[PDB]
Amino acid sequence: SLISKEELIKLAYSIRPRENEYKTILTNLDEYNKLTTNNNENKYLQLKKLNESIDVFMNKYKTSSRNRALSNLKKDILKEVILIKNSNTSPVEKNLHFVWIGGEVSDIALEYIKQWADINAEYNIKLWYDSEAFLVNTLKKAIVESSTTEALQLLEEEIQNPQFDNMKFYKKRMEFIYDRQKRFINYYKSQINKPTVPTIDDIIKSHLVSEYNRDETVLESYRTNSLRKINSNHGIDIRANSLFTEQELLNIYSQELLNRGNLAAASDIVRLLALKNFGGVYLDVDMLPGIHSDLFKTISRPSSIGLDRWEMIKLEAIMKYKKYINNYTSENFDKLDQQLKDNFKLIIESKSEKSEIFSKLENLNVSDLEIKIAFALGSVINQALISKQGSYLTNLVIEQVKNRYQFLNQHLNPAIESDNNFTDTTKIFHDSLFNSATAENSMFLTKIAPYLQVGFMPEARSTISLSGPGAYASAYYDFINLQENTIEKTLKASDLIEFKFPENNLSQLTEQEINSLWSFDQASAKYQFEKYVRDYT
Numbered sequence: 001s002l003i004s005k006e007e008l009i010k011l012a013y014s015i016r017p018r019e020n021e022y023k024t025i026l027t028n029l030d031e032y033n034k035l036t037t038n039n040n041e042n043k044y045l046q047l048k049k050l051n052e053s054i055d056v057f058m059n060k061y062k063t064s065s066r067n068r069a070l071s072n073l074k075k076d077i078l079k080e081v082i083l084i085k086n087s088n089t090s091p092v093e094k095n096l097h098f099v100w101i102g103g104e105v106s107d108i109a110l111e112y113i114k115q116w117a118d119i120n121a122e123y124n125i126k127l128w129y130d131s132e133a134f135l136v137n138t139l140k141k142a143i144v145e146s147s148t149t150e151a152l153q154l155l156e157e158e159i160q161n162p163q164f165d166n167m168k169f170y171k172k173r174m175e176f177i178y179d180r181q182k183r184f185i186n187y188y189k190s191q192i193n194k195p196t197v198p199t200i201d202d203i204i205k206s207h208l209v210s211e212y213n214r215d216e217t218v219l220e221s222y223r224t225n226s227l228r229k230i231n232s233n234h235g236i237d238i239r240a241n242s243l244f245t246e247q248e249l250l251n252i253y254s255q256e257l258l259n260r261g262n263l264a265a266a267s268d269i270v271r272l273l274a275l276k277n278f279g280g281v282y283l284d285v286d287m288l289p290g291i292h293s294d295l296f297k298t299i300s301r302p303s304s305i306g307l308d309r310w311e312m313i314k315l316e317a318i319m320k321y322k323k324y325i326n327n328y329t330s331e332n333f334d335k336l337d338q339q340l341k342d343n344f345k346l347i348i349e350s351k352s353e354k355s356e357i358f359s360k361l362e363n364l365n366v367s368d369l370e371i372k373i374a375f376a377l378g379s380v381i382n383q384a385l386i387s388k389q390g391s392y393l394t395n396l397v398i399e400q401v402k403n404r405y406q407f408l409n410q411h412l413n414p415a416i417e418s419d420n421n422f423t424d425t426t427k428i429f430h431d432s433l434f435n436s437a438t439a440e441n442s443m444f445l446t447k448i449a450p451y452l453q454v455g456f457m458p459e460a461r462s463t464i465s466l467s468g469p470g471a472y473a474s475a476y477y478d479f480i481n482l483q484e485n486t487i488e489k490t491l492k493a494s495d496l497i498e499f500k501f502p503e504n505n506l507s508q509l510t511e512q513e514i515n516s517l518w519s520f521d522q523a524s525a526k527y528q529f530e531k532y533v534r535d536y537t
């Protein structure tokens, strides 16, 4: 709790008379202490009011002696926020949310999911999907593959000189990709409002048949067998469950699903809506349950193996002997000297039930204010989440997302509208975007400039700052500091220990997690490039 009005009166004592702004603080603080309620959101907002009233005074009477004491109070308030969110704690809705959008859900994913299912039978599995978009991944593959061979022919006579920037290939292919997306988006807009009310898949199908020389019956078979498959595996349609409660959110989701073909970004939107509406736990399909914390204590990590690769080896080991996921890599565990391998073999083979190899989630006690998130490399990462339905913070995150898109699209829309090619569209976008740059937004603006390239070029990672981690991180900042609409600052892993997804509940560092599906690094760029050229032989 906070100090009493009376107490504040002693500590901030000044020979001078009470400023009206001080009197207001005094009143907000007293009002807060006497706040007779158990509603967390209510208590938080009153904290917020109090904190704002303090900032006003302080930012007006910069010379006031009261400021020492009032700064102490702003410190106390930060702590109070944590006190509030760490009370009225109860277990999350027992749902496991997964998202697979845009094609057939893979058997591998189904295997990862199965491990969650086994350990946590008391939880409800929801495998979210879009019933109208099973053909999106095909479209993306057809577009990217065509553009690849276009760019290769174009550069056929330069690609193998040593000094050949693989990047010249990527800039050029992106011109072709962008054109092909405008081509598809345009056809789409010519169809979507017909009286025949066609679906996304209907439009994609037509397009592919006529413009990529694909067979319709095969497309249809793939479609129905993707829908068949997902329904048989916990599948639930986002279109049939009022996840999108307003056009704005459907629009954002759609620009990712259709215009960019960024399935991960579309997934970023869905998971927030699903937690908002149903509460529970979100998990990317490449996460696995946490390993029992004490299972492996007896075996000591060699000094030559780093922390992360040790966690990896543990996982490869459990899989070597239990084979819960065929045929899980063992590339790291086979490098172990013998004596070590046998220490793993002994321990793992002794355990009898999957029950006692991985930890059960059990009750995850959270407050209606918070959302918990996993960490990675010093930043939050949204591959794993916990939130009660309708939580304050989850709303903050959703709001951050809408605010970011709004800014993005205000500058992006006209640029696209121009039908310019990629390069010129980018300049129109950038000139606009950067003309509105301030110290406060400059970083954000820098991080979204290469938006159009996300998914097709190396190190285009705008997603982070629209719908991914960045949005969460600023939402935390908002929450923790009783701020609103924060764009400049992001809380990092060292800031968020109170909001961490419990370390013993999650195995990040899975074999599937080792590679991304909306992005790729410069070294796999130099790699995919070669694969491309090698093949083009």
Ligand SMILES: O=c1ccn([C@@H]2O[C@H](COP(=O)(O)OP(=O)(O)O[C@H]3O[C@H](CO)[C@@H](O)[C@H](O)[C@H]3O)[C@@H](O)[C@H]2O)c(=O)[nH]1
Pocket: 098, 099, 100, 101, 102, 137, 263, 264, 265, 267, 268, 283, 284, 285, 286, 381, 382, 383, 384, 463, 464, 467, 468, 469, 513, 515, 516, 517, 518, 519
């Ligand atoms: O064809 C696809 C590809 C991706 N996804 C979704 O995207 C998620 C994550 O994709 P992943 O291959 O694991 O990419 P990452 O590089 O690991 O993605 C990171 O960055 C993304 C963008 O912010 C976030 O959505 C992820 O949670 C975060 O782990 C998946 O679990 C799916 O739900 C699909 O639904 N269909």
Ligand SMILES: [Mn+2]
Pocket: 284, 286, 383, 512, 513, 515, 516
């Ligand atoms: Mn992943």
